[model samples]
Target: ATYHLEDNWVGSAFLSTFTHEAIADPTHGRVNYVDQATALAKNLTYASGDTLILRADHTTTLSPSGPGRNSVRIRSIKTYTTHVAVFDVRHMPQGCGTWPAAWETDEGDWPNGGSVDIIEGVNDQSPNAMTLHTGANCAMPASRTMTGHATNNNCDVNTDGNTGCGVQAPTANSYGPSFNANGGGWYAMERTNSFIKVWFFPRNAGNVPNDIASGPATINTDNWGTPTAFFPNTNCDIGSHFDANNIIINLTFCGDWAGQASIFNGAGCPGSCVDYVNNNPSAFANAYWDIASVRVYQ
Candidate 1:
């Protein structure tokens, strides 16, 4: 089906189209999100040519009781329902103790509003994970035509510690260091009544679809082929589970997911997640996002 462009956020539009969320990190990450003024003055967020850069502070060692390392978390002011969102990314936050994600949700409503984690992972993990979190009565089929591996089938936030339903990307370079090394890629999600599908097009692949690569005014999902993550509405009604959601991009250090002892240590990261993030300021140098544009179509 043909989709018309509804919003195109590029360059300076990053600042105008989104709002800096300076509030506390709800995930309990070792992060101190700064307001727009602070973010701009400290170089946490900026625009360079066609790229919009969002970065974490890498110059300060913090005390245990401090507010945590400084970072930027922004969300689109406008929200969407049934639509398509595409992100042209050049680099994403990486390194130990870091949790980076690009997602959509109704910030105030939480689990009841439903959520879509389009790109997320921790501790420099290779291969991204896409997940969905919703109220009760949402589940995914074990069998689906997609390139990713289904790690869970339940989308209810009340079950299994809110693990939600998730899909892991097939390729190692789909996220983290390998992704940045290959010049990042385009992350696209098409949300409809029938399904919520996500696609990853690595820049190094040299085979990005023309529509996505060129950032066309319109997009045809039929030519996009199989997606990396597909959540079909076979067992759940999309409209009831999801509502208008704001696009969110954030990087935090050692949060609920990454701060876990098993996860941090299992990833070969030394020291406690909080301790590492607090003391190793320079270690987070690569923790940043270099984006070209974010477009929404419907």
Candidate 2:
């Protein structure tokens, strides 16, 4: 946990300067992913009371068969290594056919630099999903617990359903609609040489880091015991698998993961994802992100 300051990504300022793109080229969800220029013009993102508001178009019925709906997906222009990322959120995107995430990954060589899905959920999931998508020769141990439930250990997306390895956060309000009802929460990820840990602090739970509610706080994962998910290098070799990652926050719908009919149906959300999405516009009323800030420490 001993480190020096490296970066601080303020929500309002970052959004004003972030790179708005196609939410990863429409490969994730049936989303058109409104660009920066369009997003600003259409009011998908803006500043409200100094806080940055990133939201999707909830008023219009979008063609699911086409590129998708009007939404904003942004990535930080810069990259970082061996640092801590802290995200303060007042509310997060959620709902059926909705898959929202705040995380980091590489743009250069793909999974070689590793990818961390710090805050993620699909359809109507109530728990957060913490996952890692990596390149070859990296595998995790299922026996190694990180506080949250371990769903899988093999991070190699090539072999594991081609979906990568991750953990399922064991909480009802860690993600999705329930999170917004409880006033959202804070998500923190600490990635270092040896290990990577993700933590969640529920709103009004009196368990949030003191400095987070007041100022830029110094983070020591040691003080925050039993993270939501823990990934160590004992078997995975983090040094070779993870590095130079860019922070990203975006809202997409019914892509590869959540787009499957069975996935949606299992979540108690009936109907084809595409059909439900294209026909329903106001259904995504809760599909938006209200971020407070994003700060990083060396």
Candidate 3:
């Protein structure tokens, strides 16, 4: 068991070690990213070695066509590669116009160092959409089927823009409401030179890997069954695309990916995304996260 880092109940301590950015929304999310001071003062996130909660405010309302809503976006102070990362989540932000993601990437240029979308969804999604965003040359082998189905094969932004290479989880309750109903679950992403694989285990699944349940040693993918998503670097060099990737957990409102009516409306959400989100405060009651912990193994 080789443990790198872990975040348990010390939410405040966690904030002290991470970066809080207020940059213009990269996803064009109708988001007003806040600083660490604002987050702690407003109780947007609360941690104390027992539980950690990351929530989106439901009291403030704005115009559908107006500015974005206040939210939390933070990144780890360090970078990583060729490691296993696990997340034990009790709940996640979900609903119309609510775009949340837990991913990893580097700075400078986009998609060149690669980005891994671990937990992401929008507009009341039932399942998760895992993606790998890279520069110019990367593709998953067509022969490798996953626990989730593939939506695209090209991982290069040069080819698909922000579309990236994506996969749809096969489990009906792998995310969102059903996930919470199942008492949340464990999500693991294993990054290596040849591939990066994702695995999901419901809280009640009764079979989470022992190493992950109480880890710091080693993990074996062979016994984990089929991966929810698998991205191989056979077509592209892994080191060239995925460099020092910093972990991030963010909850933002609609914009580039979810704000666009074409995509948000497709989720069967009523009215406009920003419209529904702006006016309906109660709709985002569950737009928060209850994380048991985040584990990093090297």
Q: Pick the candidate with the highest lDDT.
A: 1
Q: Candidate 1, clashing residue pairs? A: none
Q: Residue by residue across 175-284, what tens digits does model 1's lDDT show?
A: 99999999998999999988999999998766678878887888998999899999999998978899999999999989889999999999999989999998999999
Q: Residue 109 in model 2: shift from native, Å?
A: 1.4
* Model 3 lDDT tens row, 45-143: 777674678878777887756667777888888788888888888888877888888889986666688899999888768688899999887877776
Task: Tell how far residue 4 is off in model 2, in angstroms.
Answer: 4.2
Give the runs in model 1 whose Cα sits over 4 Å from its true position. Answer: none
How far residue 175's Cα lies from its native spot in candidate 1, in Å, is: 0.5
In order, candidate lDDTs are 0.92, 0.79, 0.79
In candidate 2, position 55 carries an lDDT of: 80
Query: Candidate 2's residue-wise lDDT over 1-298, tens digit each?
Result: 7544466555457755568876454446777787777888888987655477788788777654466777887888888888888888888887788888898988678867889999988896878989998987777776675768877788997878866778888787788778888888888888987888898888876877754554344656566667889888877888778888889888888878898888999998878888877878888877888887777778
Error of 2 at 45 (Å): 0.8
Off by over 4 Å in 2: 23-28
Which stretches in model 3 have alpha-carbon errors above 4 Å?
Answer: 1-10, 63-66, 216-218
Clashing pairs in 3: 1-216, 1-217, 2-216, 9-49, 30-254
